[PDB]
Amino acid sequence: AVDTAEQVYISSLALLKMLKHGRAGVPMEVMGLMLGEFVDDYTVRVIDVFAMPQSGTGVSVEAVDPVFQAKMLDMLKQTGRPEMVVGWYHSHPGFGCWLSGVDINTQQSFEALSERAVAVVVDPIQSVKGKVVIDAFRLINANMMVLGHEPRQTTSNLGHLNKPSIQALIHGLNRHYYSITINYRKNELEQKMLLNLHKKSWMEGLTLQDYSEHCKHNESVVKEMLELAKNYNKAVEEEDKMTPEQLAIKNVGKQDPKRHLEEHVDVLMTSNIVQCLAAMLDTVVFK
Amino acid sequence: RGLAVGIALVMYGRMEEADALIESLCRDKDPILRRSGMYTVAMAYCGSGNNKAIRRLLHVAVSDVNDD
Amino acid sequence: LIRNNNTDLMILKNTKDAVRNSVCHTATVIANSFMHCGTTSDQFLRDNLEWLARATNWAKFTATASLGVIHKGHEKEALQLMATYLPKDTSPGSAYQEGGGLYALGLIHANHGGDIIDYLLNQLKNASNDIVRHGG
Amino acid sequence: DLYSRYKKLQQELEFLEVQEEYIKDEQKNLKK
Amino acid sequence: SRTGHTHMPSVVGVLVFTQFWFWFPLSHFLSLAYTPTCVIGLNKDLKMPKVQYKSNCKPSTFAYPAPLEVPKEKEKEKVSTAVLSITAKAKKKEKEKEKKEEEKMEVDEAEKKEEKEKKKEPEPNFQLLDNPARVMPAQLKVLTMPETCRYQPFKPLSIGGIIILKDTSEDIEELVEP
Ligand SMILES: [Zn+2]
């Protein structure tokens, strides 16, 4: 009985507790616990995340408070749901993700206690634009050290979700743990009530943004579009057989032809239509 | 996934009698079961140039979000 | 299929030498079973075994499955072939032999109703759990 | 002869309407 | 299949073979889709008679060689001496020295052309074939019935599978059972 290509399920609230606790203590490598359920042999799920108070030692086994462990679990049994811990996490701000020296020491305690106890490393400050730098890892033994680690077998969902990155494979990764796959438990009864309630405005759709700010904009764009038409005349009346596909590449200027064309005309079209349709509907509805 | 191919393979070439089941599996939000209906509409319409099949199968080939 | 046995052995050897320490062993024992399908020609299960005994934990399930692929459509001799490589007389500790063995009987006698349906019926009455009920 | 030609022109016409509908979606999709 | 219908094993065998992402040992199921490219000339319930019939290929022959298992024994063996110098007229006067030594003492060697071209053109597209005869499915229509033999077919023979021969008039013979 040995590993395969596993799968990690995370709940929607679990990821939100990760990025919020990471954004809170952005300099000093925050630490917390991960509470879920072992559903089968080789897929792990997590429903809940609660953090840890800050220890002066740092991210290690000494940052784990056993009296804050059991008494926090004492409350969650009688309210909500009791379940077994399945792992832990921390935050590593200075890089993306790889298990460091004091990372790997406290992992050995957890895999001695649990079956797997999957680690999770998240950089809070790297994740900015629309994506999150989250990855989960899991330590390997020394029994197959001259053999091929990660004993994976009959599947084809292993080549996805990441290739081993060179900022991560220069450290441990390969001959010390392995990487694991993470998707999201995307659910209904949460997805639309997060979408429609976060981005919404009722009366904005039929406002006017006035005329004194709007006729000035219609005044402005036509004036350079006149000179854009004069520059459009210049290339059309030119029309010389100087190998015109080579004549165009020696006359590149990030300019006219068709790019600096009707793009403005489309904006002039859409602005006045939405302005006039809002004007005509408002005369219709109100008295 | 074992029952995905299994309910696709319980019907074979009925060519009109699966259409209530084809509509039922794809309207659900289970991604495996939507995938299971796609193997079901394949095996119920074997070798026939069905215009309704090639319309509907290409329609979910555009607009659906899961890759599988 | 036995009187027109022109397969090639050296192509399978000129792909054998490039086999590194990956899980391509399952990919090779599915390759020879394709190009010896119905041939009933066992030479790779004769000329070498130490390379065949390298991979494990599902390749044994794959290899004894490939034994049934080479013997596709072997009605009576396939019963006594397995009778020799029995689900309980090769090794009682490996469930992958008895799992893929019952899977190999299904590969041989597809679309053939007989005692082999009843023979696999009685061994799904008394079986282990995980990789016995698969190939059964 | 002629009945088979009339059925195949029915089929091919309803075929390339569907592949016309595919390119309508993709050109709409690539704008987004 | 043969007669316009489609196979139920060849469909089911290939569609679970598509599911080799999620499980590698489902790839054994493609063996169901392996249908023979052979004809069978069984006339009686037991006799398969040894019959000879031929081909109608347009300009040649093909199929089933699989011959090539050379390791391509290659040699570096040389780098060409490209000293272009007084060498050029020095080898030329050496070839003048051979025009006194070769053609005046003994050189009478000869060879013959077009022996190897001769065997190619009268070739056989008329290949004769016993009972379980393989044939590529592209040549189910450019085969030829055994009309030159005594034992001539009865079933319309245009696609591979199994047929009856009309084993014609008396003295029936030619068993084969291995
Ligand atoms: Zn760390």
Query: Residue A206 gets which letter from DSSP?
Result: G
Place of tokens 């509470």: A35
Q: Which residues pair with A43 in a beta bridge?
A: A7
Residue C93 zone, left/alpha/beta (φ > 0; ψ -120 to 50; rest): alpha
Q: How many CB atoms lie within 10 A of CB D6?
A: 9
Query: Residue A260 gets which letter from DSSP?
Result: I
Query: Residue D14 gets which letter from DSSP?
Result: H
Asked if C107's CB is within 8 angstroms of E31's CB, the reply is yes
Asked if A43 reaches chain E (Cβ–Cβ under 8 Å), the answer is: no
Q: Which distant-in-sequence residues (6+ apart) come within 8 Å of C58 by Cβ?
A: A153, A154, C26, C96, E24, E25
User: Could you give the CA distance from residue E108 to residue E102 in angstroms, rounded to a whole number?
Assistant: 10
Q: Which residues pair with A137 in a beta bridge?
A: A119, A179
Mutant choice from D22, D27, D29, D30 vs B, greatest count of B C-beta within 10 A: D22
Closest residue in E to A156 (Cα) is: E21
A150 in helix, strand or coil? Answer: coil
User: Could you give the CA distance from residue C45 to residue C41 in angstroms, rounded to a whole number?
Assistant: 9
DSSP H helix total and E strand total for chain C: 8, 0
Query: Residue A179 gets which letter from DSSP?
Result: B
User: Could you give the CA distance from residue E95 to residue E88 in angstroms, rounded to a whole number?
Assistant: 11
Asked if C28 reaches chain E (Cβ–Cβ under 8 Å), the answer is: no
Say if residues C33 and E28 touch (Cβ distance below 8 Å).
Answer: yes
Please, what's the b/e burial string for C69-96 (b: 16 or more CB within 10 A of its CB; e: otherwise)?
bbbbebeeebbebbeeeebeeeeeeebb
Asked if E32's CB is within 8 angstroms of C34's CB, the reply is no
Q: How many CB atoms lie within 10 A of CB A63?
A: 19
Say if residues C3 and E178 touch (Cβ distance below 8 Å).
Answer: yes
In whole angstroms, how large is the CA radius of gyration of chain D? 14
For the CA atoms of A201, A206, A211, A212, what is the dihedral angle to 10 degrees? -20
Cα–Cα distance list, A168 to A71, A95, A100, A121, A137 (Å): 37, 9, 11, 12, 12
Place of tokens 């991960």: A34
- What's the number of CA atoms in the CB half-sphere (13 Å) around residue C120? 23
Say if residues A235 and A256 touch (Cβ distance below 8 Å).
Answer: yes
Please, what's the b/e burial string for A231-254 (b: 16 or more CB within 10 A of its CB; e: otherwise)?
bbeeeeeeeeeeeeeeeeeeeeee
Cα–Cα distance list, A127 to A96, A122, A184, E152 (Å): 9, 9, 17, 81
Say if residues E16 and E26 touch (Cβ distance below 8 Å).
Answer: yes
Q: How many CB atoms lie within 10 A of CB A9?
A: 17
Cα–Cα distance list, A253 to A236, A250, A260 (Å): 16, 9, 11
Q: How far is CA B6 from the centre of its chain?
A: 12
User: Could you give the CA distance from residue E10 to residue E153 in angstroms, rounded to a whole number?
Assistant: 30
Place of tokens 């009268």: E122
Chain E residues whose beta carbon lies within 8 Å of the beta carbon of residue B47 = 6
Asked if A154's CB is within 8 angstroms of E21's CB, the reply is no
Say if residues C102 and C135 touch (Cβ distance below 8 Å).
Answer: yes
In whole angstroms, how large is the CA radius of gyration of chain B? 11
**Total length of chain D:** 32
E in contact with D (at least 3 C-beta pairs within 8 A): no
Resolution expressed in Å = 4.1
User: Could you give the CA distance from residue A20 to residue D21 in angstroms, rounded to a whole number?
Assistant: 45
User: Could you give the CA distance from residue A145 to residue A100 in angstroms, rounded to a whole number?
Assistant: 20
φ, ψ of residue E166 in degrees (nearest 5) = -85, 95
Chain B residues whose beta carbon lies within 8 Å of the beta carbon of residue D26 = 62
Helix residue ranges per DSSP H, chain A: 12-24, 66-78, 101-113, 166-169, 191-198, 215-236, 244-249, 263-285
Query: Computed from CA positions of residues B29, B33, B38, B40, in that sequence, does the dihedral angle turn out positive or negative?
Result: negative
Say if residues C122 and C83 touch (Cβ distance below 8 Å).
Answer: no
Q: Any binding-site annotation on A214?
A: no
Exposed (0-12), middle (13-18) or buried (19+): which is E87, by Cβ within 10 Å? exposed
Q: How far is CA E133 from the centre of its chain?
A: 14
Say if residues A92 and A62 touch (Cβ distance below 8 Å).
Answer: no
Please, what's the b/e burial string for B22-58 (b: 16 or more CB within 10 A of its CB; e: otherwise)?
beebbeeeeeebbbbbbbbbebbbeeeeeeebbebbe
User: Could you give the CA distance from residue E133 to residue E131 in angstroms, rounded to a whole number?
Assistant: 5
- What's the number of CA atoms in the CB half-sphere (13 Å) around residue A60? 7
Which DSSP string corresponds to C90-107?
S-TT-HHHHHHHHHHHHH
In terms of Cα–Cα distance, which of C69, C68, C77, C98 is closest to C86? C98
Say if residues A107 and A172 touch (Cβ distance below 8 Å).
Answer: no
Query: Residue C6 gets which letter from DSSP?
Result: -
In terms of Cα–Cα distance, which of B53, B54, B61, B55 is closest to B14? B53
- What's the number of CA atoms in the CB half-sphere (13 Å) around residue A127? 21
User: Could you give the CA distance from residue A14 to residue A10 in angstroms, rounded to a whole number?
Assistant: 6
In terms of Cα–Cα distance, which of E142, E136, E133 is closest to E165? E133
Which DSSP string corresponds to chain E?
-TTS---HHHHHHHHTTTTTSS-GGGGGGGGGG----B-----SSS--------B--SS---S---------------------STHHHHHHHHHHHHHHHTTTT--------SSTTTTTTT--S-----TT-B--GGGSSSB----SSSSEE-S---SSS---EE--SS--------
Chain C residues whose beta carbon lies within 8 Å of the beta carbon of residue A154 = 26, 58, 62
φ, ψ of residue C102 in degrees (nearest 5) = -65, -30
Say if residues A176 and A104 touch (Cβ distance below 8 Å).
Answer: yes
C24: enclosing H helix or E strand: helix C24-29
Query: Computed from CA positions of residues A49, A50, A53, A57, in that sequence, does the dihedral angle turn out positive or negative?
Result: negative
Q: How far is CA A118 from the centre of its chain?
A: 20
Asked if A159 reaches chain E (Cβ–Cβ under 8 Å), the answer is: no
Cα angle: E33, vertex B33, A190; to 5 degrees:
155
Q: How many CB atoms lie within 10 A of CB C53?
A: 12
User: Could you give the CA distance from residue E30 to residue E96 in angstroms, rounded to a whole number?
Assistant: 72
Minimal C-alpha gap between E56 and chain C (Å): 23
Q: Any binding-site annotation on A90?
A: yes
C56 in helix, strand or coil? Answer: coil
User: Could you give the CA distance from residue E22 to residue A153 in angstroms, rounded to a whole number?
Assistant: 10
Cβ-based interface (< 8 Å): residues of E facing B:
6, 8, 11-12, 15-16, 19, 22
B39: enclosing H helix or E strand: helix B31-43
Q: Which of E6, E16, E19 sits opposite B46 (nearest CB)?
A: E6
Cα–Cα distance list, A39 to A6, A43, A180, B18, C61 (Å): 12, 7, 17, 34, 25
Cβ-based interface (< 8 Å): residues of D facing B:
11, 14-15, 18, 21-22, 25-26, 29
Say if residues A95 and A107 touch (Cβ distance below 8 Å).
Answer: no
Q: How many CB atoms lie within 10 A of CB A176?
A: 15
Q: Which residues pair with E153 in a beta bridge?
A: E165
Q: How far is CA E62 from the centre of its chain?
A: 4
Q: Any binding-site annotation on A74?
A: no
Q: Which distant-in-sequence residues (6+ apart) come within 8 Å of D18 by Cβ?
A: B51, B54, B55, B58
Strands A43-51 and A85-91, sheet pairing: unpaired
